[PDB]
Design a protein around this ligand. Structure first.
Ligand code: HEM
Ligand code: HEM
Ligand code: HEM
Ligand code: HEM
Ligand SMILES: COC1=C(OC)C(=O)C(C/C=C(/C)CCC=C(C)C)=C(C)C1=O
Ligand SMILES: COC1=C(OC)C(=O)C(C/C=C(\C)CCC=C(C)C)=C(C)C1=O
Ligand SMILES: COC1=C(OC)C(=O)C(C/C=C(\C)CCC=C(C)C)=C(C)C1=O
Lengths: 53, 48, 61, 105, 378, 111, 75, 49, 108, 53
C-alpha cells in the first residue's frame, strides 16, 4: 500500500535529494575510515602513509 | 614510580598546542554569535 | 587571490552543509597526521634522551 | 537640621554613590527585591511609571551584560532620585497588615 | 507545529536547553552549573572504566590501582582524570555555592535546598572515593572520619560499628564503601534533575538581582556556546592538572599501602574538607566538635532566613561585599589551618577563624543588610 | 518556522507540479492586472522609466514558460540560501525569534 | 515553565540589531577593552583585596611564629 | 513483615568471620627495657606495653 | 488549588499514580508493568547489599559469594532473593510482552 | 515579625490540635520503640518480655 509514494513528484523529490544523500555517504565513509584508521582503505591515500609499508 | 611520565608530557604538550588553537577559535565563535547582542541599540519612545 | 579566496571556500564548499561536513572530515584526517608528526618532532627536539639510543643495543639481534 | 544632619545626609549620599545603581541609570526603587508586596505595588503603578521602570531595568540589564556603565552625566543623581514605588508599597503593606490583624481575632 | 516543540522527549530538551528564556546578562559564575554537569559525567565515565579493573578486596585493592597505571592501556590518565576531576568537582561546587550567596540566588528555596542535598551527597561520595585505593591516608582518613559519629550520645558506638562492619576499618568496610561510591553518583544525577526542575519554575537570577523578564534571550545560541567555551576552560584546568601535576593536590603517603598499626604524623583530609576539619578540631570537645563540624555545612540551609537586605544581589551593596570577601578569605585561612598541625600559632588562629565564620554568616552579614537598608532610607 | 521552512524547501527540493501552479498564478496575475486604461497607462509609464521598453505580454509569457523546478531551486538558492535577512517587527513581539535563530533558519543542516 | 510571549508586558522600546556576519567579533578589543578592565578593577579592589591581604599577612606571620617557636636559647 | 525484611537487611551489615577476638597475647617483659614503649597487635588493635 | 496538583514534584506523581485516567476494565495482565517495577527495585536493593561483600576478583569471587551465605547475617536470603528475583523478572517480562501481543498494545 | 501568628484565634487553633499532636507523638514513640526493640523502654511492658531477665 506504499503506492502512495509512487508518482512524478516523488520521482522529482528523490532526484533533488540524491547529490545530498550521496555526499552524506561520502561524509559517513571518510568519517568511518578516519575514525577506525581503516588500514585497507587508508593505505591508498597519497599522504597519511603513517603505517610505512 | 611514574612510568607514564614521558608520554604524559607529550600529550600535555599536544594539550597545550590544541588548546592554544581551540581556545581563541571557540571564543571567536561565541563572540560572533553574541555580536547581535553586544552592539544592539535601544531607544525608548513613549506617547506625548 | 585574497577577497576571492575565502569567497571560493564558501562557494565551493561551505554553502551546502554536505560539503561543509565532508571538508571538515577530509580536513580532520590530514590535520591529524600533520599535527601529530609536527608535534612529535617538537617533543623530539626539546629532548633526545629516549630511543635515539636504540641504534646501539639493537641491530645485534 | 545643622552639621549632624548634613553629615548623616552626606554619609547617605556617599553610600548611594558607592552602591552604584546610579551608574546604570537605575533608581533605588528599580533595585527592590520582588516579593508579593512589591509585585503588587509594581502592578498598581500607573502606565507611565510602569513603562519608565521597564526601560530603566532594560537599560541596566543591557549595560550589566556588556559590563559597561553610563557616562557620568547620565548617572542618576542622589535626591533627584524619585522614590516612585514607596507610596504604593506602603499601602500594600498597610493592607496586608490589616488582613493580618483580622486573622488574629 | 514543529518537532522540537511537540515531541514528548524533545520538549524536555527544548524547554531546558533550546528555547529556555534566559537572562541576557548572566556572567561566568553562571557557568559552574553546566561545569558541575560535565564534572558529574566525567566522574561517572572515568569512574566506570576504573571499575572494570579495580578490585574491592584489601588483598588486591592497591595492586589493582597500580595494575591500572602500568599495565592497563591508558589506565593512568583515566585514573588521574578521576582523581583530579574530583577536585575540579569541588572547585566548581565552591564557586557555585559562593555565586549563589553573593547574588542572592538562594531565595529560590527548593532549588537551593536541593543544592545543599547535592553538596552533602557529593561530599559523602568523594570521602568514600578516597578510601578505595587503600593507601595510608585512605585508611586513616576512613578511621578519623567515621569515628566522629561515636560522639553521638548512647547511639554513637553501635552506629560507628554498624557502618564499619566490625570494630575497625577492615575488609567489610572497603567493599562497603565501593558499593556506595558506585550508586551515589546516579542518585546525585536524579537529584540534579530535580534541582533543574525547581530552577525552571523561575528561570535564572542575574548579577543585578533585579528581575530580567524584560530582557530574556534564548538559551539557543547564547548560552549553549558560552557553556561550550566554558567546558573547554574546565578541560584546560583538569588536563593541566593531570598531564603536568597529577599529585600536586594529592597526598604522597596514600602511596604507601594501608597499615592499621602505622599512624602517620600527618593525618588530614583531602583539601576540600580542610576548612570543616579546621572548624572541627578548634573545639576542645568530642560532641561539640562534630556538632559544629556538621553546622559549618548545614548553615547554608539557614542562609535564606538570614537575608535581611531589601535588594537581592550584592552588586549594589558595598558593605556586604566586604563581609562576603572576608568570608572567602576566612575560608582560605580555615583550609590552610586545617592542613596544619594542632601546635603553636595554628590553634588560636584556627580557633578564632571558626568563631569568625559563624559570626560572619550568623550575625555580621545580616546586620550589614539592615544597615545598608537604613543608608538607603528603606 | 513555517515561512523559512518553505523558502528552504524551494531552495533545495522544489518540485515540478508546484512550479506550473506558480507559473499559472503568475500568468493570471499579469493579465488580470492589465485590465482597464488605468493600470495599463501606469504600466507603460513605469516600464519606460525602468526598462526603457514596454515589455509585451508575449515576452513575459516566454520568460514565465522557461521557468521549471530546476530554475526555481537555483534562483531561490541564490537569493535565500544562507543569506542575512532584514527583519522588522512591531506590536507584541516578545516571541519574535532572536536574530541568530532567524539567521540559522536561512540554511539547512539536512542539505 | 516560562516560555516566550508569556513573560511580562513591555511597551515603547525599539531594538536595533545587526547581523553577526556584518560586524566584528572583537571591535575596539584592546582599545576600549583594557580601560574597561582597569575601571572594573578600581571599582572592586577596595572590596575584594583587603580581606585577602589580611589572610596573606596572617599566613606569613603564622608560619614564622610556628617555625621560630621550635628553637630555644637558655633553660 | 516490613520490620523483619528491614531488620534483616540492617543486620547484614554487622558480624561475619569477625567474631575472632582470640589473641590473649603473652608478652615477655625482659624484651622491653626501661623507658621504651613496645606496641603489639591485639584483637586487630594496637596494644601498648 | 490543591497541593498535589500544583507542586512541581507532586504533579508528576499525581499525573502518574493518582489522578491518571485509567480504563475501568484492565485485568491482571496489566499488573505486570508495576510488578516489573517492583522486580527492578528488588533487583537493585538486594543487588546493592550483595555488592557490599562481593569481590570481583577470580581469586575470591566464588569464596565471597560463599562468604555471604554462611557468614554474612541473612546474607543467604538476600543472595537467593537476588537469584530468584532475576527469574521473577523474566516471568513478568514474558507475561508483559505476551499481553502486549495478544491485546494489540504494540500499536503504541 | 512572627507576631502575625499571635492572637486568640491562633491560640484556639493550637489547642484544637493538641490532642492530635500529642497522639501523633504516642504513635511515633511506640513506633520507634517497637521498631528498634528498645530494651530500656520495652522491659517495663507486662507481656513482650521476650528478653527474659
Ligand atoms: C551536583 C551538584 C550541582 C549541580 C549539577 C548543579 C547544576 C546547576 C545548574 C545546571 C544551574 C543552572 C546554571 C547555573 O547557574 O549555574 C544551577 C543553578 C543553581 N544551583 Fe546548582 N548545581 C549543583 C550544586 C548546587 C549547590 C551546591 C547549590 C547550593 C546549595 C546549588 C544551588 C543553586 C542555585 C540557587 C542555583 C540558581 C542560581 C541562579 O540562578 O543564580 N546547586 N545549578
Ligand atoms: C558512579 C561513578 C563512579 C564510579 C563508578 C567510581 C568508581 C571509582 C573507583 C573504582 C575508584 C578506585 C580507583 C581509584 O582510586 O582510582 C574511585 C576513586 C575515587 N573516586 Fe570515584 N567513582 C565514580 C564517581 C565519583 C564521584 C562522583 C566522585 C566525587 C567527585 C568520585 C571521587 C573519587 C575519588 C576522590 C576517588 C579516590 C582518589 C583516587 O582517584 O585515587 N568518583 N572511584
Ligand atoms: C524494565 C521492563 C519494563 C517495565 C518496567 C515496564 C513497565 C510498564 C508499566 C508500568 C506499564 C503500565 C502498566 C501495564 O500495562 O503493565 C507498561 C505497559 C506497556 N509496556 Fe512495559 N515494561 C517493561 C518492559 C516492556 C516490554 C518488554 C515491552 C514489550 C517490548 C513493553 C511494552 C509495553 C507496552 C506496549 C505497554 C502498554 C500496554 C497496554 O497499555 O496495554 N514494556 N509497562
Ligand atoms: C544495580 C543493581 C544490581 C546490583 C548492584 C547487582 C549486583 C550483583 C552482584 C554483586 C552479584 C554477584 C553476587 C551473586 O551472585 O549473588 C549479582 C548476581 C546476579 N544478578 Fe545482579 N545486580 C543488580 C541488578 C540485577 C539485575 C537487574 C538483574 C537482572 C534481573 C540481576 C540478575 C543477576 C543474576 C542473574 C545474578 C547471578 C545469579 C546469582 O544470584 O548467583 N541483578 N548481582
Ligand atoms: C581524616 O581526614 C579527614 C577527611 O578525609 C577523609 C574528611 O573528609 C573530613 C570531613 C568530612 C566530612 C564528611 C564532614 C561533613 C560532615 C557532615 C555531617 C556534613 C575530616 C574532618 C578529616 O579529618
Ligand atoms: C539559563 O540559566 C542556565 C544556564 O546558563 C547559566 C546553563 O548553562 C544551564 C546548563 C545545564 C545543563 C547543560 C544540564 C546539566 C545537568 C545534568 C544532570 C547533566 C541551565 C540548566 C540554566 O538554567
Ligand atoms: C493505568 O495503567 C497503568 C497501571 O495499571 C495497569 C499501573 O499499574 C501502572 C504502575 C506503574 C508504576 C507503579 C511505576 C513503576 C515504574 C518504575 C520505574 C519503578 C501504570 C504506570 C499505568 O499506566
Amino acid at each position: 500500500m506504499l503506492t502512495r509514494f509512487l508518482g512524478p513528484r516523488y520521482r522529482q523529490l528523490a532526484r533533488n535529494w540524491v547529490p545530498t544523500a550521496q555526499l552524506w555517504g561520502a561524509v559517513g565513509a571518510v568519517g568511518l575510515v578516519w575514525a577506525t584508521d581503516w588500514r585497507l582503505i587508508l593505505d591508498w591515500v597519497p599522504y597519511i602513509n603513517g603505517k610505512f609499508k | 614510580a611514574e612510568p607514564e611520565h614521558d608520554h604524559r608530557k607529550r600529550m600535555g604538550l599536544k594539550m597545550l598546542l590544541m588548546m592554544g588553537l581551540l581556545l581563541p577559535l571557540v571564543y571567536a565563535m561565541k563572540r560572533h554569535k553574541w555580536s547581535v547582542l553586544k552592539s544592539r541599540k535601544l531607544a525608548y519612545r513613549p506617547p506625548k | 587571490v585574497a577577497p576571492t579566496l575565502t569567497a571560493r571556500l564558501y562557494s565551493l564548499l561551505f554553502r551546502r552543509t554536505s560539503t561543509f561536513a565532508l571538508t571538515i572530515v577530509v580536513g580532520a584526517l590530514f590535520f591529524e597526521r600533520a599535527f601529530d608528526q609536527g608535534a612529535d618532532a617538537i617533543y623530539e627536539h626539546i629532548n633526545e634522551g629516549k630511543l635515539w639510543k636504540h641504534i646501539k643495543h639493537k641491530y645485534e639481534n | 537640621v545643622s552639621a549632624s544632619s548634613r553629615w548623616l545626609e552626606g554619609i547617605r549620599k556617599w553610600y548611594y554613590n558607592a552602591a552604584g545603581f546610579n551608574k546604570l541609570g537605575l533608581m533605588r526603587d528599580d533595585t527592590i527585591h520582588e516579593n508579593d508586596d512589591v509585585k503588587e505595588a509594581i502592578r498598581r503603578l500607573p502606565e507611565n511609571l510602569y513603562d519608565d521602570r521597564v526601560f530603566r531595568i532594560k537599560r541596566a540589564l543591557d549595560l550589566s551584560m556588556r559590563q559597561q556603565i553610563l557616562p557620568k552625566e547620565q548617572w542618576t543623581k542622589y535626591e533627584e532620585d524619585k522614590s516612585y514605588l514607596e507610596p504604593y508599597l506602603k499601602e500594600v503593606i498597610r493592607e496586608r497588615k490589616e488582613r493580618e490583624e483580622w486573622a488574629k481575632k | 507545529t514543529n518537532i522540537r516543540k511537540s515531541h514528548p522527549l524533545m520538549k524536555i530538551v527544548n524547554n531546558a536547553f533550546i528555547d529556555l528564556p534566559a537572562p541576557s546578562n548572566i556572567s561566568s559564575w553562571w557557568n559552574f552549573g553546566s561545569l558541575l554537569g560535565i564534572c558529574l559525567i566525567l566522574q561517572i565515565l572515568t569512574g566506570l572504566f576504573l571499575a572494570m579493573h579495580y578490585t574491592s578486596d584489601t588483598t588486591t585493592a592497591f595492586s589493582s590501582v597500580t595494575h591500572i597505571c602500568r599495565d592497563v592501556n591508558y589506565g593512568w590518565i583515566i585514573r588521574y582524570m578521576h582523581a583530579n576531576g574530583a577536585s575540579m568537582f569541588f572547585i566548581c561546587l565552591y564557586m557555585h555555592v559562593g555565586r549563589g550567596l553573593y547574588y542572592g540566588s538562594y531565595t529560590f528555596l527548593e532549588t537551593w535546598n536541593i543544592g545543599v542535598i547535592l553538596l552533602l551527597t557529593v561530599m559523602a561520595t568523594a570521602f568514600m572515593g578516597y578510601v578505595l585505593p587503600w593507601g595510608q591516608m585512605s585508611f586513616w582518613g576512613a578511621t578519623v572520619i567515621t569515628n566522629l559519629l561515636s560522639a553521638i550520645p548512647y547511639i554513637g558506638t553501635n552506629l560507628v560499628e554498624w557502618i564499619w562492619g566490625g570494630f575497625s576499618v577492615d575488609k567489610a568496610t572497603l567493599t562497603r564503601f565501593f558499593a556506595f561510591h558506585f550508586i551515589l553518583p546516579f542518585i546525585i544525577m536524579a537529584i540534579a534533575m530535580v534541582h533543574l526542575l525547581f530552577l525552571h519554575e523561575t528561570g535564572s537570577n542575574n548579577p543585578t538581582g533585579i528581575s530580567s523578564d524584560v530582557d530574556k534571550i534564548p538559551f539557543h545560541p547564547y548560552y549553549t556556546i558560552k557553556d561550550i567555551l566554558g567546558a573547554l576552560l574546565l578541560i584546560l584546568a583538569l588536563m593541566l592538572l593531570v598531564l603536568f601535576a597529577p599529585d600536586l593536590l594529592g597526598d604522597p603517603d596514600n602511596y604507601t599501602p594501608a597499615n592499621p598499626l602505622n599512624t602517620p604524623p600527618h593525618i588530614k583530609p583531602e583539601w576540600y574538607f580542610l576548612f570543616a576539619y579546621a572548624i572541627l578540631r578548634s573545639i576542645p570537645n568530642k560532641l561539640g566538635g562534630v556538632l559544629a563540624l556538621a553546622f559549618s555545612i548545614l548553615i547554608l540551609a539557614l542562609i535564606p532566613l538570614l537575608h535581611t537586605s531589601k535588594q537581592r544581589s550584592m552588586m549594589f551593596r558595598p558593605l556586604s561585599q566586604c563581609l562576603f570577601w572576608a568570608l572567602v578569605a576566612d575560608l582560605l585561612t580555615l583550609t590552610w589551618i586545617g592542613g596544619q598541625p594542632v601546635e603553636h600559632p595554628y590553634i588560636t588562629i584556627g580557633q578564632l577563624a571558626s568563631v569568625l565564620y559563624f559570626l560572619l554568616i550568623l550575625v555580621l552579614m545580616p546586620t550589614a543588610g539592615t544597615i545598608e537598608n537604613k543608608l538607603l532610607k528603606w | 518556522f513555517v515561512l523559512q521552512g518553505q523558502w528552504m524547501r524551494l531552495c533545495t527540493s522544489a518540485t515540478e507540479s508546484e512550479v506550473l501552479r506558480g507559473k499559472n498564478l503568475l500568468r493570471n496575475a499579469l493579465v488580470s492586472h492589465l485590465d482597464g486604461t488605468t493600470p495599463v497607462c501606469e504600466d507603460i509609464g513605469r516600464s519606460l522609466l525602468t526598462y526603457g521598453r514596454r515589455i509585451p505580454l508575449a515576452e513575459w509569457e516566454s520568460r514565465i514558460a522557461e521557468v521549471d523546478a530546476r530554475v526555481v531551486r537555483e534562483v531561490c538558492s541564490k537569493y535565500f540560501y544562507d543569506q542575512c535577512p532584514a527583519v522588522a517587527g512591531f506590536g507584541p513581539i516578545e516571541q519574535l525569534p532572536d536574530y541568530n535563530r532567524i539567521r540559522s533558519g536561512m540554511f539547512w543542516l539536512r542539505f | 515553565g516560562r516560555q516566550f510571549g508569556h513573560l511580562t508586558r513591555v511597551r515603547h522600546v525599539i531594538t536595533y540589531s545587526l547581523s553577526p556576519f556584518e560586524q566584528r567579533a572583537f571591535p575596539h578589543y584592546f582599545s576600549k577593552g583594557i580601560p574597561n578592565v582597569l575601571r572594573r578593577t578600581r571599582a572592586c579592589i577596595l572590596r575584594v583585596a583587603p580581606p585577602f591581604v589580611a589572610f596573606y599577612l596572617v599566613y606569613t606571620w603564622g608560619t614564622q611564629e610556628f617555625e621560630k617557636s621550635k628553637r630555644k636559647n637558655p633553660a | 513483615a516490613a520490620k523483619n525484611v528491614v531488620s534483616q537487611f540492617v543486620s547484614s551489615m554487622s558480624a561475619s568471620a569477625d567474631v575472632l577476638a582470640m589473641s590473649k597475647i603473652e608478652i615477655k617483659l625482659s624484651d622491653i627495657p626501661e623507658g621504651k614503649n613496645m606496641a603489639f597487635k591485639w584483637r586487630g588493635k594496637p596494644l601498648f606495653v
